[PDB]
């Protein structure tokens, strides 16, 4: 895999070249969302209100990404009903405020559904 | 939309060479997501499947470090 490891980098360097050049907002959002540690946990669902797990690593990302019960991601609209914490322990919206930040278990994990 | 077909063909192979042809279900969904993109005749559906396909590569905690790929680009 050693020489394979060189042809490996060439293909997926080239891929993110062809992705930066695609210049989609949805692609460029999920790509750069993931660069600061905010990555999907399952495939993005396009279907009507199917399951979407994403990882949020810090409150900064949080108050950058969460509008009440609505979390914007992937140039789409997402509706939540499951936010757990690092110790797989469920949290609540109100509890993720600017006033509770340092006590909580980052990263958090939101579960989401496509919005009508 | 020449490009979006082509990004798609290469995303699948990046995931293929990451030995997810073993993946059977992960693979199958990508194979038809790649197949549906090829059969697209407009931009949105094509970017809409394209966004899902790439979610897979980003959800693989060690498939590759995007920070170190990104840091490799302009260095």
Curated annotation (Swiss-Prot), chain B:
It is found in: Host cytoplasm, Host perinuclear region; Host cytoplasm; Host endoplasmic reticulum. It comes from the Viruses. Residues 1-75 form the RdRp Nsp7 cofactor domain. Plays a role in viral RNA synthesis. Forms a hexadecamer with nsp8 (8 subunits of each) that may participate in viral replication by acting as a primase. Alternatively, may synthesize substantially longer products than oligonucleotide primers. Interacts with nsp8 and nsp12 to form the replication-transcription complex (RTC): nsp12, nsp7, two subunits of nsp8, and up to two subunits of nsp13. Eight copies of nsp7 and eight copies of nsp8 assemble to form a heterohexadecamer dsRNA-encircling ring structure. This is Non-structural protein 7. It comes from Severe acute respiratory syndrome coronavirus 2. The chain holds residues 3862 to 3936 of 4405 of the full protein.
């Amino acid at each position: 895999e050693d020489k394979r490891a060189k042809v490996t980098s060439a293909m997926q360097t080239m891929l993110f070249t062809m992705l930066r050049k695609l210049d989609n907002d949805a692609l460029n959002n999920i790509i750069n969302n993931a660069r600061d540690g905010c990555v999907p946990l399952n495939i993005i669902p396009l279907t009507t209100a199917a399951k979407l797990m994403v990882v949020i690593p810090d409150y900064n990302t949080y108050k950058n990404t969460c509008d009440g019960t609505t979390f914007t991601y992937a140039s789409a609209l997402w509706e939540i009903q499951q936010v757990v914490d690092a110790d797989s322990k469920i949290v609540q919206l109100s509890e993720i405020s600017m006033d509770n930040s340092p006590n909580l278990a980052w990263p958090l994990i939101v579960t989401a559904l496509r919005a009508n | 939309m020449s490009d979006v077909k082509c990004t798609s063909v290469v995303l699948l192979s990046v995931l293929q060479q990451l030995r997810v042809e073993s993946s059977s279900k992960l693979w199958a969904q990508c194979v038809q997501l790649h197949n549906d993109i090829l059969l697209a005749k407009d931009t949105t559906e094509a970017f809409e499947k394209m966004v899902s396909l790439l979610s897979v590569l980003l959800s693989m905690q060690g498939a590759v470090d995007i920070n170190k790929l990104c840091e490799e680009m302009l260095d």
